[PDB]
Each structure stands twice: as C-alpha cells, then as structure tokens.
Amino acid sequence: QGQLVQSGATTTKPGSSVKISCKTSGYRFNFYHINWIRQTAGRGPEWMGWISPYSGDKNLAPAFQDRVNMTTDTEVPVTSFTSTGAAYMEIRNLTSDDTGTYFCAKGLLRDGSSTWLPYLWGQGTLLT
Amino acid sequence: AVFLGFLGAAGSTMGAASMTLTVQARNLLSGIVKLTVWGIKQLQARVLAVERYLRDQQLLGIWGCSGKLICCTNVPWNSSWSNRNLSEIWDNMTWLQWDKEISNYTQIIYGLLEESQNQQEKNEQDLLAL
Amino acid sequence: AVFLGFLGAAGSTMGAASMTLTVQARNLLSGIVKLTVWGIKQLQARVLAVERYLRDQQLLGIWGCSGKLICCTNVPWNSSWSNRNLSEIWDNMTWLQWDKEISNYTQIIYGLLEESQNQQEKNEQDLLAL
Amino acid sequence: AVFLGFLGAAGSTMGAASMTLTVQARNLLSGIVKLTVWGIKQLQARVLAVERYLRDQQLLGIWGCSGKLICCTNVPWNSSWSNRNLSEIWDNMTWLQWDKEISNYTQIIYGLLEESQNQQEKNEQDLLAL
Amino acid sequence: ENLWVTVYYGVPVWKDAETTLFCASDNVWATHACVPTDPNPQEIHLENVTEEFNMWKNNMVEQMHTDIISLWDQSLKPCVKLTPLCVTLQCTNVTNARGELKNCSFNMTTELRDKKQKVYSLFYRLDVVQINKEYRLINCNTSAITQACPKVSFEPIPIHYCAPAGFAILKCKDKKFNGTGPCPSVSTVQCTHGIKPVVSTQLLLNGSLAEEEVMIRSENITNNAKNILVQFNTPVQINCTRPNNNTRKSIRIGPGQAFYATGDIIGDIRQAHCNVSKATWNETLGKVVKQLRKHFGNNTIIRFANSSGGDLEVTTHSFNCGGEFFYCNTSGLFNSTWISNDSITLPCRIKQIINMWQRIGQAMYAPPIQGVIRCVSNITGLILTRDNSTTETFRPGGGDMRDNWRSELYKYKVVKIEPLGVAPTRCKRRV
Amino acid sequence: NPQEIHLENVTEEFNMWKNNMVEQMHTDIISLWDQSLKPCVKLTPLCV
Amino acid sequence: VLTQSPGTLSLSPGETAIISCRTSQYGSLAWYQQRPGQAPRLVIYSGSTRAAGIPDRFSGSRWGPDYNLTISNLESGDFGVYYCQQYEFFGQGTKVQ
Ligand SMILES: *[C@@H]1O[C@H](CO)[C@@H](O[C@@H]2O[C@H](CO)[C@@H](O[C@@H]3O[C@H](CO[C@H]4O[C@H](CO)[C@@H](O)[C@H](O[C@H]5O[C@H](CO)[C@@H](O)[C@H](O)[C@@H]5O)[C@@H]4O)[C@@H](O)[C@H](O[C@H]4O[C@H](CO)[C@@H](O)[C@H](O)[C@@H]4O)[C@@H]3O)[C@H](O)[C@H]2NC(C)=O)[C@H](O)[C@H]1NC(C)=O
Ligand SMILES: *[C@@H]1O[C@H](CO)[C@@H](O[C@@H]2O[C@H](CO)[C@@H](O[C@@H]3O[C@H](CO[C@H]4O[C@H](CO)[C@@H](O)[C@H](O)[C@@H]4O)[C@@H](O)[C@H](O[C@H]4O[C@H](CO)[C@@H](O)[C@H](O)[C@@H]4O)[C@@H]3O)[C@H](O)[C@H]2NC(C)=O)[C@H](O)[C@H]1NC(C)=O
Ligand SMILES: *[C@@H]1O[C@H](CO)[C@@H](O[C@@H]2O[C@H](CO)[C@@H](O[C@@H]3O[C@H](CO[C@H]4O[C@H](CO)[C@@H](O)[C@H](O)[C@@H]4O)[C@@H](O)[C@H](O)[C@@H]3O)[C@H](O)[C@H]2NC(C)=O)[C@H](O)[C@H]1NC(C)=O
Ligand SMILES: *[C@@H]1O[C@H](CO)[C@@H](O[C@@H]2O[C@H](CO)[C@@H](O)[C@H](O)[C@H]2NC(C)=O)[C@H](O)[C@H]1NC(C)=O
Ligand SMILES: *[C@@H]1O[C@H](CO)[C@@H](O[C@@H]2O[C@H](CO)[C@@H](O)[C@H](O)[C@H]2NC(C)=O)[C@H](O)[C@H]1NC(C)=O
Ligand SMILES: *[C@@H]1O[C@H](CO)[C@@H](O[C@@H]2O[C@H](CO)[C@@H](O)[C@H](O)[C@H]2NC(C)=O)[C@H](O)[C@H]1NC(C)=O
Ligand SMILES: *[C@@H]1O[C@H](CO)[C@@H](O[C@@H]2O[C@H](CO)[C@@H](O)[C@H](O)[C@H]2NC(C)=O)[C@H](O)[C@H]1NC(C)=O
Ligand SMILES: *[C@@H]1O[C@H](CO)[C@@H](O[C@@H]2O[C@H](CO)[C@@H](O)[C@H](O)[C@H]2NC(C)=O)[C@H](O)[C@H]1NC(C)=O
Ligand SMILES: *[C@@H]1O[C@H](CO)[C@@H](O[C@@H]2O[C@H](CO)[C@@H](O)[C@H](O)[C@H]2NC(C)=O)[C@H](O)[C@H]1NC(C)=O
Ligand SMILES: *[C@@H]1O[C@H](CO)[C@@H](O)[C@H](O)[C@H]1NC(C)=O
Ligand SMILES: *[C@@H]1O[C@H](CO)[C@@H](O)[C@H](O)[C@H]1NC(C)=O
Ligand SMILES: *[C@@H]1O[C@H](CO)[C@@H](O)[C@H](O)[C@H]1NC(C)=O
Ligand SMILES: *[C@@H]1O[C@H](CO)[C@@H](O)[C@H](O)[C@H]1NC(C)=O
Ligand SMILES: *[C@@H]1O[C@H](CO)[C@@H](O)[C@H](O)[C@H]1NC(C)=O
Ligand SMILES: *[C@@H]1O[C@H](CO)[C@@H](O)[C@H](O)[C@H]1NC(C)=O
Ligand SMILES: *[C@@H]1O[C@H](CO)[C@@H](O)[C@H](O)[C@H]1NC(C)=O
Ligand SMILES: *[C@@H]1O[C@H](CO)[C@@H](O)[C@H](O)[C@H]1NC(C)=O
Ligand SMILES: *[C@@H]1O[C@H](CO)[C@@H](O)[C@H](O)[C@H]1NC(C)=O
C-alpha cells in the first residue's frame, strides 16, 4: 500500500554500468522481498532476481547472476508499520540488447508459497 | 519450532503467532512471589491482575470458548468488518496491525458471540428434552 | 426478543427469564474502571466481587457445568423438593418465587451434583482405560 | 463410601484418595465469611487465596483439563520419571509419597502438557477448516 | 467465502497504558520492602517490532518522582521534630581569620519540663539569619523542621520498576535512540534495570552511560525553555570532599528527643570542594559540542557559561556526599567558547536545613556526619539550557527534579496486554 | 462449629522451635500493643 | 527572523484585513491584536487555531513558511496594530485604521 519510486532514464553506451535506485514508502521495507523485472526490445519480460531486505539473502536467474549487482540499505522507520527503504541495481557487461524499461517490485506476502511474488511495482526506468 | 519467548512474534505473521499462544497464556497471571509504599501499591497491582484476567475468562465463558486457545464459532465474517482475503491476513499483517483495523467493529462482534452461545445451549436444551 | 436489560425479567416467568442469561452473566463481574476513605473501601469491594464470582465458578466446575449457562445433570428431581408440575413452574412463578420454595433443599441438591460428577469422570476414567 | 473429610485420605492409597477429589476441591477457596491489624492482614490473605487458586485453574485450562478432576492427556509416561509398576503405585504409596519422587520431573511434565494441548486445538483447527 | 469469526486467546497485541508499577530490590527508599529481585532477569527480544516512544510523555518518571517524594515523607515520620530548636541563637564566628560556619549557643529544653540548659553548636551560615549578635534557624518563619533519623541511609540503591501481571515494559535497544520517535529494535522486560535514585543537579551523577556516541535529548531542541539532557558515553571522574573533621554531639531535648549537634572541628579548618580532570572534562565538553552542531550548524559558535540566577539548589551543583548536601559552584566547569596533573576545583558550600524537591511546608535537618567526608562519583549526564542569530550559548539548569529519573527511564514504556483477538477463518462449530 | 478432620494413616514431622506461628503471633501482640496506645494520652509533661 | 508586512493598512468598517508574516524557521506561530491604549490580545495560536472569545471572522491559514491572518468583516473595534509571534520574536506590527 505504498509507492516504490525509482531513478530517471539514464542512457549510456555498451560496456559501462548503470545504477538504478528504488526508494520505498508506505510499508515496512524489511517485510517484503524486492524483485527486479525488465521488458527489453527483443524479448518480452524476464525475471532478473529478488533480494530480502530482512535476511539479506539473494536469489537471481542464471541469465543475470554474473552481471547484476543488487544491494539494499536499511529502512528508516517512520511508524510501527511504515518505513522508508532503498533498493539498488547495477549491471556489468552492458550491451544494446539490454535496452528496455526496468522496475523494482515489492514481494507479495510475508509467508506461504508466494512470499516473493512481484506484487507492488515501481514506475519504470528506460536504459540505453 | 523456535522458542521465541513472551510476545516473540509481535512483529510476525498472524499465522506464525497463532501457533504460540500458551506462551502468553502463562505469563498473563504470573503468580505468587505490609503497609509501606510499595506494600499497598503491590497489593493494588495484584488485585488488578486477577480482575483483567477474569474478565477475559468471563468473556470466553459466555462465548462457549471457556478453555480454548483457538475457538471456532457460528458468527459469519461480515465483509463490513474487514473485506480482506484470507491469505492477505494470516500470511501478511501482524496481530498488532489486525487490532487497529478491527478496533471499531470489535464491540459488535463481542455481542454477536454472546447470543450465538445462548441460542446454542437453548437449542441443546430442547435437543436433550426427549 | 426485547432487550429488557439487567434483571429485566425479575418479575417474569422462569421460561422467559431463562432465555436472557448472558445479560446478568456480564455485569456480575463488571470490570476495571490510594489510601483515603473510599480508596481502602473500594479495594475491599473489588476483592469481594471476585470472591463471590469464583465461588459460583468453582461450584459450577465441580458439577461439570463449567462454561454452561443452562446445564443438564443426572440428579433426578425429588418430589419432596417441589411436587409441582412442569407447566405450573416455567410458565407461572418467577425465579424469585422459585428460590423461596427451594431455599430449604438447595443445600442437599448442591451435594448431589458434586458426587454425580465425580462418579462420572471416574466412570469415564475406566471407559478410557482400554 | 465413608465421608473421611478434608484430606482424610492423606495417608491412604492413591487409588482410594483419587475417588474423593470434590472434597478438597470445595475448601480450596472456602468463601466470604477495615484498617486494623487483622483487617489489613485478612485482606492480604483473601487475595493470596484467589491467586494460588487461579494459578491451578490457569494451568488446568492450558492443558485442556479445565473443569476436570481426573484428566487424561496424550503425554506418555516416561520411564525416567518413575519406572514403577501401575499396581505398586495406585494400591501402595500415597499421594504424599508420590509427590516426593516426582518433585524433580514435575516441571518437565507441565511443559509437555501445554504443547500437547496447543498441538491439539491446532489440529482440530484444521479438522474444522472444511 | 465460508468465513466465520474465530476467537483467539493469547495473541501478541498491546496498548499504551499507565498502571501502578511496583518496585523490586536485591535506607530512606525502603528498598528492603520491595519484592526480592529475580536473579534471572528475563529479556525477550521482540523481533520485527517497531514501537513509538516518548521519554517526555513517559509516566514512569512521573510515578517514580512521586514514589521518591512519598518515600521521603514516609521515612521522616518517626524522626525527631526540631521545633524547640527554633529559639533565639547567640552566635559568634568560629576562630580563624572568611567567617563561614558559626558557633551558636542557646537556652535549650531538657528532659525535665522545668529545667533549661545552655548548650552550643556549630551551624553553617546558610542555616541561620540575624534579627537586628543574635540569629535564628532559617526555617522558623516558614515551616516546621524534622531531623533526619541517623539510622536511615542516604545511599542510592538500585531500584527495579516492574509492571504488574497482564502488563509489560517495552525496552529499546537502539544505541542512537533519541528520546522520541520509533525505536526500531524493541525488546520486552518484566522489570527495569537497577535505577539508582541519585538526587543531583546540573551534573547527573552515577547514572547509566550511553553506548557508541554521546547523544543529547530535549523534546524540542529549538525551544530554549526546554531542559536539554546530554548523556555522556565516557565517565568523567569527579572527586568531592569536606576536609573538616567534624564531631557530633547528642543533646537530650526531651523524653527520647535527642538533637544531634555539631560539637567542634578537630584539627584543621579547610574548605569543601570538588575535583575533575581538566583533560577528561575538556574532551567531554568537546564530545558535547560535537553533537550540538548537528542541531545548530557546523559553523555557529557554542558558548558555555554558569547559571544566570535563581535558587541555591539550581545555580550550583547540589548533591549528597557521605551524608551531607554540597552546593558546588560550577562556574569553573562551564567557561569555554568552542569554534572551528590538570584538576579543576569547584568551591562547594554545605547546608543542613534543606527542603529538597522544592516543596513549601517542611524542611529537614541533616545531622552532621562524623569524621572527614569524601566520596568518589562519576558524572554521566548534564542538564543544559540555551539562551538570536548564529551563535548559541549554553548554561546549566536544574529546574525540575523528574528530569533525573527521566535520564534513566527513557528506554522504557508501559503497555497493557489484551490477549483477545477475533479473526476469520473457514471454521464453524457442529450441531 | 469447629471442624476437626482426622488424618488417618498420617505421620508428620513437627518442631515447636522452628515454628513460625509463634514468631508471627509474638509480633502480632507487639504490633497490637503499639496499635492500641496511639490515641492515648502522652505523659510527657509529667517528666517534671 | 520574522518579517511582517504590511506596516500599515488603511481600511473601512466592512472590508477584510489580511496581514502576512514570513518566518525563516518553522514552529507554532501566533497572532496578537493591540487596540490603542489597551494591552495586546491573543487572536490565533499554533498557526490556525482560534483563541477563546474570538469571533469566527478571525481566521488564519498557513502554506509553508508563510502565515496569513484575515478578518472576514472589519468593525470599529477591530482597528488596531497586529503582531505575529514565533518563540520569543515578534513582528514590527501592522496598524489598521
Ligand atoms: C521477520 O519478518 C521477516 C519479513 O517478513 C520474515 O522473513 C520472511 O519469513 C518467511 C517465512 O519464514 C519467508 O518465507 C519463506 O521463504 C522461503 C525461501 O527461503 C528459501 O530460499 C532462500 C533463497 O533461496 C534461502 O535463503 C533459504 O535458505 C535458508 O538460508 C537463509 C540464509 O539467509 C536463511 O536465512 C533462511 O531462513 C533459510 O532457512 C530457503 O531455502 C520459502 O522456502 C518458504 O516456503 C516454505 O515455507 C512455507 C511456510 O512458511 C510453506 O508454505 C512452503 O510450502 C515452503 O515449505 C517461505 O515462503 C520469507 O522469505 C522471509 N523474508 C521476507 C518475507 O522478506 C521473518 O521470518 C520474521 N521473523 C520473525 C522472528 O518474526
Ligand atoms: C564555641 O563557643 C564555646 C563557648 O560557648 C566554646 O566552648 C568553650 O571553649 C573554651 C575554650 O576556647 C573553654 O574554656 C576552657 O575551659 C577549660 C575548663 O576549665 C574550667 O573548669 C575548671 C574547673 O575544673 C576551672 O578551674 C577553669 O577556670 C575553667 O572554668 C579551662 O581549663 C581552659 O583554660 C585554658 O585557658 C586558660 C586561660 O587562657 C589557660 O590559663 C589554661 O592553661 C587553659 O589553657 C579554658 O578556660 C570553655 O570551657 C568552653 N565552654 C563550654 C561550655 O564548653 C567552644 O570551644 C567554641 N567552639 C568553636 C569550634 O569555636
Ligand atoms: C556514586 O557511587 C559511589 C559508589 O557506588 C558512591 O560511593 C560510596 O559512598 C558511600 C558513602 O559516601 C561509601 O560508604 C562509606 O563506607 C565507608 C567504609 O567503606 C570501606 O570499608 C568497607 C568495609 O566494610 C569496604 O568494603 C569499602 O570498600 C571501603 O573500603 C565508611 O566511611 C562509611 O560507612 C560510608 O557509608 C561507599 O563505600 C562508597 N562506595 C565506593 C565504591 O566508593 C557515591 O557516594 C555515589 N555518589 C552519589 C552522589 O550518590
Ligand atoms: C565574622 O567575620 C566576618 C568577616 O570579618 C564579619 O563580617 C563583618 O561584619 C560587620 C558587621 O558588624 C561589617 O561591618 C564588616 O564589614 C564585615 N566584614 C567583612 C569582611 O565583610 C562578621 O561580622 C563576623 N561575625 C561575628 C559574629 O563576629
Ligand atoms: C564509574 O566509572 C565506571 C563507569 O564505566 C565504572 O567502572 C567500570 O564499571 C564497569 C561496569 O561494572 C566494569 O565492567 C569496569 O571493569 C569498571 N572499570 C573499572 C576500572 O573498575 C564505575 O563502577 C563507575 N561508578 C559508578 C557508576 O558509580
Ligand atoms: C578525626 O577526629 C577523631 C576524633 O575527633 C579522630 O578519632 C581518633 O582516632 C584515633 C585513631 O588514630 C583514636 O585513637 C582516638 O581515640 C580517636 N578519637 C576519638 C575522640 O574517637 C580521627 O582519627 C580523626 N581523623 C582525621 C582524618 O583527622
Ligand atoms: C579521584 O580519586 C581517585 C582515588 O583517589 C583517583 O584515582 C587514583 O589515581 C591515582 C593516579 O593515577 C592512582 O595512582 C590511584 O591508584 C587511583 N586510585 C584508585 C583507587 O584507583 C583519581 O585520580 C582522582 N581523580 C581526580 C580527578 O581527582
Ligand atoms: C562562583 O565562582 C565565580 C568565580 O569562579 C564567582 O565569580 C565572582 O563574581 C563576582 C560577582 O558576582 C565578581 O565580583 C568576582 O570577581 C567573581 N570572581 C571571579 C574569580 O571571577 C562567583 O561569585 C561564585 N559564585 C558564588 C555564588 O559566589
Ligand atoms: C520543534 O517543534 C516543532 C513543532 O512540533 C517541529 O516542527 C515540525 O517539524 C517536523 C519535522 O521537520 C515537520 O514535519 C512539521 O511540519 C513541523 N511542524 C511545525 C508546526 O513546524 C520541529 O521539528 C521541532 N524542532 C526540531 C528540532 O525538530
Ligand atoms: C454486517 O453488519 C451490518 C452492520 O454494520 C449489518 O447491517 C449487516 O446486516 C451485516 N451483514 C452481514 C452479512 O453480516
Ligand atoms: C473507526 O472510527 C473512526 C471514527 O473517527 C474512523 O475514523 C475510522 O476510520 C474507523 N475505523 C476504520 C477501520 O474504518
Ligand atoms: C428424596 O429425598 C429424601 C430426603 O429428603 C430421601 O430420603 C429420598 O430417598 C429421596 N427420594 C428420591 C426419589 O430422590
Ligand atoms: C424450610 O424450613 C422452615 C423451618 O422453619 C419451614 O418453616 C419451611 O416451611 C421450610 N420450607 C418449605 C418450602 O417447606
Ligand atoms: C524421557 O525423558 C528424557 C529426558 O529426561 C528424554 O531425553 C527422553 O527422550 C524421554 N523418553 C521418552 C520415551 O519419553
Ligand atoms: C532430584 O534432584 C536431586 C538433586 O540434588 C537428587 O538428589 C534427587 O535424587 C532427585 N530426585 C530423584 C527422585 O531422583
Ligand atoms: C538564657 O536565659 C537567661 C535568662 O536570664 C539569659 O540571661 C541568657 O542570655 C539566655 N541564654 C542565651 C544563650 O540567650
Ligand atoms: C529523534 O529522531 C526522530 C527521527 O529519527 C526525529 O523526528 C526527532 O526529531 C528526533 N528527536 C529530536 C529531539 O530531535
Ligand atoms: C557566574 O559567573 C559570573 C562571572 O564570573 C559571576 O559574576 C557570578 O557570580 C557567577 N554566578 C554563580 C552562581 O556562580
């Protein structure tokens, strides 16, 4: 029930790396995973990987394990059930094939068989 | 299981905190161990302890839940109280978040549970009248 | 139904007053809301409230009626207690008129209910010994 | 039967003393009948009476034994607690002799009875989820 | 779908509440009467829990501040009333050369109601006032006076505050937690830690240090009329002493009424004072001016000065040392303008006729402590008070006493447990 | 009606010297003595 | 740190007197009215809360660092000098006549 604003649409050239942010609000940042999804011009959508703001644990697709740099800060608690966190995103070997819109995504539940499912999405960040 | 302790799951899901009820059921009354400052003030606190406890046992008794830690009843869940799904409750928000959303309707529910019990032992009263 | 209130059916029939028990079951313990006159006298009254209440719960517990508002037992109705018909009681005299006629035999009945419960869990003790 | 009285079978067998439980179940709370010596000291004793009593009712409630004088459970008898035969206990040693031999393991048993009840209403919670 | 309500008993949910907390112990504070503290202090961590605190709305400090005042009046009831001492005093200076403590004689009552006696005693000038040489005790035209029982202890004992059954105390293990806001790491305790009710002023003594870095509090730091509470992370050692070797004389003033007077001074006559390490106080005053820039600016000047006026109990460092109440001039501690072997000695006075707290109605006579007095304490806190552009001066203050216990009870909060929760699930009862 | 119930087959270890009823009563009489002399006249002027 | 404008406001009984007051810091700003000879009178405090005995014509609004005070209908008694206040500082005044 909160927003997940990201960075702007920074366009670079292949070989370099791009930093993408994801500032949360309106929900406990440490209670839900942060997924990262992109939709490039050449494929459809592809699941990159999520990370736990509580356990600090990572799990990402083998197609992005040796490229993605994925970190999170620590939430600045506003109330008992509200906080403000941040999720970061970086790639390694960049090409024009990775040109697409990128967004972060808050996990679905806190327990069960769909704990990390991307429920609350960001806004989108246009890459190269 | 993990012995989280007293109120250990206050920030955990309602499905995880519901499986550790006898932990907070013990320390709600603690126990046993004459005119001064703390002396009169201790006895005033010892009386208040059993009063708030007997109110929760009296309320549980008139609902047919006397002796239950998890108690199922007849009153159906009104959508006006909380039109939320079953999965977005027991595997999401905590018992602290739940009490704030139900703080309004919590008095209406307490009356629905009372007559739902009186119109159950009265039905069973006729069920054993033959 | 008509919410007559606390003791609303004190002058009504025993059949009508028996269907509104959870009304006087709540206000028997009321609730929650340091050295002066009323201060010591209030704490003396708060203790007496829970003592008379626990006596009625202790008596209900040793009868197998713990948690019941209407409780059926095994002790048969002795005609010496009240040789009145069932229709001339529940649709006639009130609970106040009833207590005066049973004031004598009310102590014998309280003992018959106790051993009728001990010779029931003892029978069930053998019933589950196999 | 013979009305031996309060604690009449304190030196008798555990099988004979187990059939007269409602005798010591009454006088554990006695009953009903302002600033002096005994006045403050009487109120201090009246509060302690209901506290020790509610602890034994709270412990009985979280075991599923709320309302029972003899209560059967699920926890199996560990031979490390007392590797004695059933006939050399109920028709031999008294309840006073029994408490000394079990004084050690009596705290472990009290925890086994609590989770044996929570993992019973939780199982029944799923048993009525359909 | 098929969702009915289901009652849950024993759920982790609480509410903000204020109840009558009871004390536990392991003297005036009657700590022998508290319940014996449990040797096993259970602390349960409340994982995933965030709670909103506020040390300024906190009620444990309002209740304790009355539980100490009600303890003071409770301990002086059976002690001797020094009402016949309110008599015309004939005083001289004690032979020396400043004439401070006097040498007063007076016609005093005896055990027999028809006999008088001409006894003498020493009184510090802070306890007497002239008529027009003739003197009188300071409290006579104000209130009665009760002499402290010389068998009760003025020593702060670790007092543990506990919540009754059904209630709970909420800790806060955040090591940079300022007074208000939401504590991210919260745990629950049955009892608070060992609270030492050290009655102090300006400089908080024997308190609990802070981990990591030194934080300062105050509810609204920009409101100059709010006492700023600074809490050190390292302890600055302060040594105090009354070097005079005093004597105590018992004067029978009735059937069992024995007033204890100051006989004479054996040996030298010197000056009561206190010491701090100037190096430790210089680096600690640096630690305080460090965090003060995070609220006022990285370029503004921070000035330290002494008190601006008021009563004796506030303008000076007032406390207890061996059983006598000092009043230490702290002008030598607050005299540094900050921008970007050692020993500082404070001149302290001594009073026997004090009212304490600030109540107008009763004053206490502290019987003199026999022998030489010296006590070693740590100063762990500080109660400052700022004074129209970009340069902030700071002066010590000690208006309200309950700021002392508040510097120790900021980590706690009282909540009541309501274990009744109603929640839906596909469950119904049979017929 | 002073109810006395016989504990048949019962043997108990006693000790009148460790007994606490005598330590409590001895204080319940001392606390009764001081409690009864509070409103009574103090003979302090008689010390003449 | 308080800039109060205007300094003078010439109006007639029936108009609306609106007086602003810019502040550098953020806090609980208030307003005062001083009729000739009498003592100042508290009108608005904490930004927009109206004082006791003050008619509902007096109203205050806030948007960022700017605090405004407006009188819905001027009478012969509402003519005086008005001051804004935050903490211990005050404005130079605005005499309406
Ligand atoms: C405090 O609040 C936080 C945030 O809500 C809670 O953290 C969340 O807990 C829930 C339930 O405990 C988690 O959901 C589960 O997720 C696991 C996925 O983990 C598996 O895969 C991980 C990545 O591959 C891996 O790290 C795990 O391996 C272990 O090692 C890590 C090392 O860091 C260790 O930290 C882990 O704990 C693991 O033990 C693991 O292999 C998923 O498997 C779960 O599904 C199972 O369980 C459910 C029932 O719970 C069942 O229905 C399924 O069928 C399946 O059997 C479950 O979905 C969630 O991931 C956590 N993190 C979030 C939400 O961000 C924390 O528990 C709270 N603690 C307290 C004390 O309140
Ligand atoms: C506060 O003020 C009080 C006064 O109210 C002081 O108390 C007095 O102190 C003086 C000393 O400063 C005392 O005077 C001394 O008394 C001694 C007792 O002897 C008396 O009794 C014998 C009988 O046995 C008589 O023969 C004798 O004359 C005395 O009457 C004397 O022995 C002392 O004599 C000393 O001085 C003389 C003259 O200088 C010398 O020749 C002697 O050798 C000797 O050195 C002296 O006279 C007086 O008694 C005290 N009064 C009381 C009531 O106790 C306090 O000391 C003072 N306190 C402070 C801190 O200032
Ligand atoms: C801050 O805390 C300090 C320590 O917690 C306090 O210091 C204490 O001050 C009191 C009184 O001022 C002292 O009590 C004195 O005890 C000595 C005798 O003690 C010596 O002998 C015993 C043997 O029985 C030995 O164990 C000691 O270590 C000493 O060697 C007497 O002169 C008196 O009876 C007097 O009561 C404490 O001893 C002293 N503690 C320490 C550790 O120094 C200080 O007072 C506190 N400050 C404030 C303002 O409260
Ligand atoms: C104690 O000593 C002080 C200091 O010498 C005396 O103070 C003097 O008091 C007189 C009053 O008659 C003044 O005229 C002097 O100016 C004071 N001197 C100083 C330096 O302030 C005091 O009077 C002495 N007290 C007694 C009882 O002798
Ligand atoms: C004054 O100084 C320090 C404050 O840290 C205390 O001495 C240390 O106390 C801690 C905690 O008990 C011990 O672990 C250290 O070993 C102590 N240090 C030394 C050198 O002994 C001391 O107790 C404080 N006194 C107070 C607060 O009264
Ligand atoms: C302070 O003065 C007292 C007496 O006024 C001194 O006590 C004496 O101590 C010695 C031991 O060295 C004993 O032999 C004496 O009998 C004591 N005298 C009395 C009257 O009890 C004490 O030593 C002095 N202390 C200091 C530090 O000066
Ligand atoms: C306060 O007093 C204490 C105790 O007298 C001083 O600690 C002593 O310091 C010296 C010099 O370093 C050491 O030799 C002693 O061993 C210390 N005493 C103890 C008991 O450890 C302390 O230095 C004094 N501080 C001030 C500021 O005066
Ligand atoms: C506390 O000490 C300071 C100095 O350390 C005293 O300051 C004196 O103040 C008076 C005026 O009140 C001046 O005439 C003196 O010159 C000052 N002395 C010094 C050394 O600067 C101050 O008076 C002391 N406090 C009290 C209550 O006496
Ligand atoms: C002093 O108190 C004021 C009033 O409560 C605080 O002002 C608020 O500050 C917060 C945080 O920036 C803002 O969100 C509010 O809009 C402010 N309200 C007002 C009326 O100004 C101020 O923050 C406090 N001082 C400090 C240093 O925090
Ligand atoms: C829900 O509650 C409202 C009152 O808040 C009541 O009018 C309505 O009949 C209820 N509906 C159900 C389905 O319980
Ligand atoms: C409960 O009532 C208050 C009345 O002010 C209302 O503001 C609040 O929204 C209600 N609770 C819910 C969950 O709607
Ligand atoms: C009725 O009670 C009397 C004692 O009052 C008893 O002797 C008799 O056996 C009882 N009869 C029945 C049928 O219960
Ligand atoms: C109860 O006993 C009294 C004894 O005096 C008797 O008068 C009364 O009639 C008895 N009650 C009934 C209902 O017979
Ligand atoms: C008996 O108790 C011991 C601990 O005292 C435990 O290790 C063992 O598993 C138990 N065995 C049975 C059969 O209950
Ligand atoms: C209980 O523990 C004590 C420990 O000293 C031991 O001596 C005793 O034998 C134990 N009880 C039994 C029945 O073994
Ligand atoms: C005691 O009383 C007498 C009465 O004559 C008087 O002369 C003397 O000065 C008094 N003592 C004191 C110390 O005032
Ligand atoms: C304490 O911290 C919170 C947020 O971290 C802040 O809002 C509050 O102003 C701080 N307290 C003070 C006195 O500045
Ligand atoms: C504070 O310092 C000034 C300047 O030295 C001095 O005049 C004044 O008396 C001092 N006040 C106190 C209470 O120390």
Short mmCIF file of N, CA and C and ligand atoms in Angstrom, two decimals, chain E residues 178 180 217-219 221, ligand 17:
data_model
loop_
_atom_site.label_atom_id
_atom_site.label_comp_id
_atom_site.label_asym_id
_atom_site.label_seq_id
_atom_site.Cartn_x
_atom_site.Cartn_y
_atom_site.Cartn_z
N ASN E 178 17.36 8.79 20.10
CA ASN E 178 16.99 9.99 20.83
C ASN E 178 15.60 9.78 21.45
N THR E 180 12.45 10.72 21.52
CA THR E 180 11.19 10.47 20.85
C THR E 180 11.41 9.66 19.58
N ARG E 217 19.40 15.08 24.25
CA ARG E 217 17.97 14.89 24.03
C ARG E 217 17.23 16.22 23.92
N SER E 218 16.46 16.57 24.95
CA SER E 218 15.49 17.68 24.92
C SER E 218 14.37 17.37 23.93
N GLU E 219 13.13 17.61 24.34
CA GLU E 219 11.99 17.26 23.49
C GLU E 219 11.98 18.08 22.21
N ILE E 221 14.60 20.82 20.71
CA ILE E 221 15.88 21.46 20.98
C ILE E 221 15.85 22.94 20.62
C1 LIG H 17 14.57 11.80 17.13
O1 LIG H 17 14.60 11.16 15.84
C2 LIG H 17 13.40 11.35 15.07
C3 LIG H 17 13.56 10.55 13.80
O2 LIG H 17 14.77 9.80 13.81
C4 LIG H 17 13.17 12.84 14.82
O3 LIG H 17 11.94 13.01 14.12
C5 LIG H 17 13.13 13.60 16.13
O4 LIG H 17 13.03 15.00 15.89
C6 LIG H 17 14.39 13.31 16.95
N1 LIG H 17 14.33 13.99 18.24
C7 LIG H 17 14.81 15.22 18.44
C8 LIG H 17 14.66 15.76 19.82
O5 LIG H 17 15.34 15.86 17.54
#
